[PDB]
Amino acid sequence: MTEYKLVVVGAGGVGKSALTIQLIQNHFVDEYDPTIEDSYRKQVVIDGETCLLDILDTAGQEEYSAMRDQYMRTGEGFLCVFAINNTKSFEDIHHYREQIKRVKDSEDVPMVLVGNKSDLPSRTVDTKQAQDLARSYGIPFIETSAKTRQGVDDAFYTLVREIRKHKE
Ligand SMILES: Nc1nc2c(ncn2[C@@H]2O[C@H](COP(=O)(O)OP(=O)(O)O)[C@@H](O)[C@H]2O)c(=O)[nH]1
Ligand SMILES: *S(=O)(=O)c1cccc(S(=O)(=O)Nc2ccncc2)c1
Ligand SMILES: [Mg+2]
């Protein structure tokens, strides 16, 4: 079956681990060591076809590591995550997108902008702001909650579909 290599990037605290663990293991985890980088694996059916997802969940201290570099070079698509209640994490999005463009040496990189923690009412980033940013990057914007599962499959499977079209 076809395999897809996905990488979840964004500032610490935005919910990368929670989004990934929710997708892979179907549980919301409120206390996951922010310093753990790990790859996760799941067999899923997307548009009728069984796929294997391999997902790197990133920790900040590994950002410039050689081993991170190898995963980024081979990564086929990227979720750029911020939290809708944290303006700083939204401000940081360009940093992650820039790193991806550089490592892939490409303007044609499958990516989705993810606004996580949509269940929280203390919003500080507007959907219109993120949609504008996503449009400027040529990518979709998907709202998620790792807590309620809102949008979680949609974010990952949208990225997969983008990789699939990029390859095929
Ligand atoms: N309410 C809510 N909390 C979340 C969500 N995603 C993550 N969190 C919480 O935010 C904190 C940081 O999440 P974590 O996954 O460790 O972020 P990471 O540093 O990007 O891996 C934890 O307390 C999580 O439970 C979400 O969608 N909603
Ligand atoms: S790592 O130990 O090299 C590793 C663990 C699991 C899966 C892989 S990979 O699918 O070969 N590469 C990859 C790249 C980017 N994101 C996820 C997985 C590597
Ligand atoms: Mg984490």
From Swiss-Prot:
Modified residues (N-acetylthreonine): 2
Known catalytic reactions: GTP + H2O = GDP + phosphate + H(+)
Positions where N-acetylmethionine occurs in the chain: 1
GO cellular component, one term: Golgi membrane
UniProt binding sites for GTP: 10-18, 29-35, 59-60, 116-119
Result of changing residue 61 to L: Promotes GTP binding
EC identifiers of the protein: 3.6.5.2
Effect of residue 60 to R: In CFC2; characterized by a defective GTPase-activating protein sensitivity and a strongly reduced interaction with effectors
Predominant cellular place of this UniProt entry's protein: membrane
GO BP, sorted A to Z: actin cytoskeleton organization; cardiac muscle cell proliferation; cytokine-mediated signaling pathway; epithelial tube branching involved in lung morphogenesis; female pregnancy; forebrain astrocyte development; gene expression; glial cell proliferation
Intracellular or extracellular location(s): Cell membrane; Endomembrane system; Cytoplasm, Cytosol
Documented effect of changing residue 5 to N: In GASC; found also in a patient with Costello syndrome; exhibits only minor alterations in its in vitro biochemical behavior compared to wild-type protein
Modified how: Acetylation at Lys-104 prevents interaction with guanine nucleotide exchange factors (GEFs). Lysine-depalmitoylation by SIRT2 promotes its localization to endomembranes in endocytic pathways.
UniProt activity-regulation remark: Alternates between an inactive form bound to GDP and an active form bound to GTP. Activated by a guanine nucleotide-exchange factor (GEF) and inactivated by a GTPase-activating protein (GAP). Interaction with SOS1 promotes exchange of bound GDP to GTP.
Effect of residue 22 to E: In CFC2; exhibits an increase in intrinsic and guanine nucleotide exchange factor catalyzed nucleotide exchange in combination with an impaired GTPase-activating protein-stimulated GTP hydrolysis but functional in interaction with effectors
Topology within the bilayer: Lipid-anchor
Assigned protein family: Belongs to the small GTPase superfamily. Ras family.
Name of this chain's protein: GTPase KRas
Organism from which the protein derives: Homo sapiens (Human)
